Design an enzyme around this catalytic site. Structure first.
Site, mmCIF file in Angstrom:
data_model
loop_
_atom_site.group_PDB
_atom_site.id
_atom_site.type_symbol
_atom_site.label_atom_id
_atom_site.label_comp_id
_atom_site.label_asym_id
_atom_site.label_seq_id
_atom_site.Cartn_x
_atom_site.Cartn_y
_atom_site.Cartn_z
ATOM 1 N N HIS A 1 0.762 -1.243 0.000
ATOM 2 C CA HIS A 1 0.000 0.000 0.000
ATOM 3 C C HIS A 1 0.795 1.298 0.000
ATOM 4 C CE1 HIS A 1 -3.723 1.992 -0.326
ATOM 5 N NE2 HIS A 1 -4.444 1.006 0.177
ATOM 6 N N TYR B 1 -13.776 5.004 9.827
ATOM 7 C CA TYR B 1 -12.947 5.537 8.754
ATOM 8 C C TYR B 1 -13.501 5.067 7.435
ATOM 9 C CZ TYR B 1 -8.576 6.604 6.175
ATOM 10 O OH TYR B 1 -7.641 7.122 5.306
ATOM 11 N N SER C 1 -12.434 6.133 3.226
ATOM 12 C CA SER C 1 -11.532 6.922 2.385
ATOM 13 C C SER C 1 -12.272 7.579 1.241
ATOM 14 C CB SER C 1 -10.439 6.016 1.820
ATOM 15 O OG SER C 1 -9.477 6.765 1.119
ATOM 16 N N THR D 1 -5.744 10.979 -0.520
ATOM 17 C CA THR D 1 -7.067 10.664 -0.029
ATOM 18 C C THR D 1 -7.387 11.612 1.127
ATOM 19 O OG1 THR D 1 -6.240 9.013 1.513
ATOM 20 C CG2 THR D 1 -6.884 8.239 -0.654
#
Length: 627
Positions: free
Chosen positions: A341, A455, A457, A468
């Site tokens: 990532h 959360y 994004s 983001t």
């Protein structure tokens, strides 16, 4: 030809004229931070945080913000957030497995026989290399978000915009309500890897390299997929090479080197240095520079749980976790992309995935009857050999123990809610994404009796070097609606429940629109913190507030994809007592793939999500909800 797209607009046509990422007003960021804290904190805690916010906004925060804006104005070639964001993830010392690397799995080829492992591995590989060539040729269509595809996503428009200089091209798209996206990350799809180093890891690329890396049974193989002239190697030769690898009868190595990529980054940084000292740099360079890593697993998928575990982590032997991505193909042709990532926000990965699925299924390179070329794979395929010291062997053993112990704590399961999805919800004038998020809030209240940090994004890639922003779905409105459904269902009329859901949806939409414009609060507050630390200052009191730590301890961590190529995706929780909620709202159904560690219960959570979706749909249909 060997290209999977033929764009008349150069891929990078819009990059020079993308708008700059906005920085919010500090007053707005503080109000939004507090708005997100309201559902999470008791009155006493909230008053304390409110007081810290007031002090921050008038004092050290005001000064950091002034400096952040000045710095931004001196660095107009980039965004205020991109550097700080890369830095966070490259500095993080935790294992990338589970903590960070997610997966997305392909739908099968709709033609049954094309799901043969050799066939599919060949076709996905060739499509991937076609993508590489198309990107490098500038023949990939620019990434663009259209509000009206009918006017802006047309040959007519494309024929004109190609003549507009890159200094003005964005404005031409803007004029037709289209928003080109940043594509500066896309090159790291290929020939790229993350190298463990002290302090902060390195992102490495070697665009000269022409070979694929293949892992099978923990053994490493390399062969060229581009020839010395830059053309794709004959697909029938690629087929022969993969068949050679599949036919190899060596058992799993005593010390599978791939385990090392799952270690703590300081541990792995040291062990990689020791590999170098022991003469393995040339071998490591072949691994690092390969176009990508293809992983051939020798078992079929038992069910979706097994699929998720396999694609998220496997058994530790047959993934090179550091690579930009691993393309995995199992014995029954089930395929997925597991990716690292740190190198970007995943938009590049989704584009790749979508194009590769389309190309490999609509214009496959080979068929299940294709005959491998009569080629000397024993010469053309190099089996890599690592020289392992006692310390390295012990390191691999320790890596395996850590990996196995961690994976044992992970549970994953899914639901497929069949009653309806996007079509039904849109008819009820609701945002499907908002409804899914409401269901997770409601389910967590049912299960644990709490409202927790959540959360979601949102891409800010409409801006130069955009990244983001965090959408905060846990709101005053979702808390209210959840309390109504779960705790006082008899106190409210169906009309009152409907209004509450409409309010949830409106507010979620507002936060979504705001976040896409860089008007969330999370990135701004992080950038100010990063600035203070970078300048050698003590952390401001705002950030020592337990409420700030709680806001960033994301118990409900959520992610969605909307693509016909994607069967499902998955990721582990981001905290020990968290859930990792992969979801998708399809036209007629809703899918959820949820992970947990020992401290939470994914199965019970999923039963709660199902029930909550039932109640939401009942209420929308005008039915009294079932107690």
């Amino acid at each position: 030809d060997d290209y999977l797209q033929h764009s008349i607009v150069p891929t990078m046509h819009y990059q020079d004229s993308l708008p700059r990422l906005p920085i919010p007003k500090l007053e707005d960021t503080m109000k939004r931070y507090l708005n997100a804290q309201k559902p999470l904190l008791d009155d006493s805690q909230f008053r304390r945080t409110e007081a810290l916010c007031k002090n921050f906004e008038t004092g050290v925060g005001k000064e950091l913000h002034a400096h952040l804006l000045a710095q931004d104005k001196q660095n107009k070639h980039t965004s205020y957030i991109s550097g700080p964001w890369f830095d966070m993830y490259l500095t993080a010392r935790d294992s990338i497995v589970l903590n960070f690397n997610p997966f997305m799995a392909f739908n099968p080829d709709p033609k049954s026989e094309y799901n043969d492992q050799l066939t599919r591995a060949t076709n996905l590989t060739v499509s991937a290399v076609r993508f590489l060539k198309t990107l490098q040729a500038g023949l990939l269509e620019p990434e663009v978000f259209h509000l009206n595809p009918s006017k802006s996503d047309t040959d007519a428009f494309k024929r004109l915009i190609r003549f507009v200089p890159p200094s003005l091209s964005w404005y031409g798209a803007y004029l037709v309500n289209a928003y080109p996206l940043d594509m500066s990350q896309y090159f790291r799809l290929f020939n790229s890897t993350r190298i463990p180093r002290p302090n902060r890891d390195e992102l490495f690329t070697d665009t000269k390299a022409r070979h694929l890396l293949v892992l099978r049974k923990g053994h490493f193989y390399v062969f060229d997929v581009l020839d010395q002239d830059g053309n794709i190697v004959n697909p029938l030769e690629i087929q022969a090479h993969l068949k050679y690898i599949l036919s190899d009868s060596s058992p799993v190595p005593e010390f599978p080197v791939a385990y090392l990529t799952s270690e703590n980054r300081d541990v792995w940084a040291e062990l990689r240095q020791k590999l170098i000292f022991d003469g393995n740099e040339e071998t490591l360079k072949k691994v690092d520079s390969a176009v990508f890593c293809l992983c051939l697993d020798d078992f079929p998928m038992k069910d979706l749980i097994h699929l998720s575990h396999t694609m998220l982590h496997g058994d530790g032997t047959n993934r090179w976790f550091d690579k930009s991505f691993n393309l995995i193909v199992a014995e029954d042709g089930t395929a997925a992309v597991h990716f690292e990532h740190s190198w970007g926000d995943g938009v590049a990965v989704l584009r790749f995935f979508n194009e590769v699925f389309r190309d490999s299924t609509q214009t496959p390179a080979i068929t299940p009857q294709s005959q491998p070329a009569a080629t000397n794979s024993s010469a053309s395929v190099e089996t890599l050999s690592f020289n392992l010291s006692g310390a390295l062997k012990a390191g691999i053993t320790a890596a395996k123990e850590k990996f196995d112990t961690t994976v044992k704590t992970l549970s994953i399961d899914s639901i497929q809610f069949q009653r309806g999805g996007k079509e039904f919800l849109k008819k009820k004038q609701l945002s499907p994404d908002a409804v899914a998020q409401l269901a997770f809030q409601m389910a967590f209240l049912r299960q644990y009796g709490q409202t927790v940090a959540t959360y979601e994004s949102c891409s800010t890639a409409a801006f130069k070097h955009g990244r983001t922003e965090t959408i905060r779905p846990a709101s005053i409105f979702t808390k209210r609606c959840s309390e109504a459904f779960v705790r006082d269902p008899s106190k409210h009329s169906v009309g009152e429940l409907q209004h509450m859901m409409a309010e949830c949806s409106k507010y979620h939409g507002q936060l979504t629109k705001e976040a896409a414009m860089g008007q969330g609060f999370d990135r701004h507050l992080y950038a100010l913190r990063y600035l203070a630390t970078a300048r050698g200052l003590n952390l401001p009191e705002l950030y020592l507030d337990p409420a700030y730590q709680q806001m960033n301890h994301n118990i409900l961590s959520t992610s969605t994809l909307n693509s016909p190529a994607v069967s499902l995706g998955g990721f582990a929780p981001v905290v020990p007592d968290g859930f990792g909620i992969a979801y998708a709202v399809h036209d007629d159904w809703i899918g959820c793939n949820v992970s947990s560690y020992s401290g939470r219960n994914a199965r019970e959570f999923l039963h709660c999500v199902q029930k909550c979706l039932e109640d939401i749909f009942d209420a929308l249909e005008g039915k009294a909800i079932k107690t």
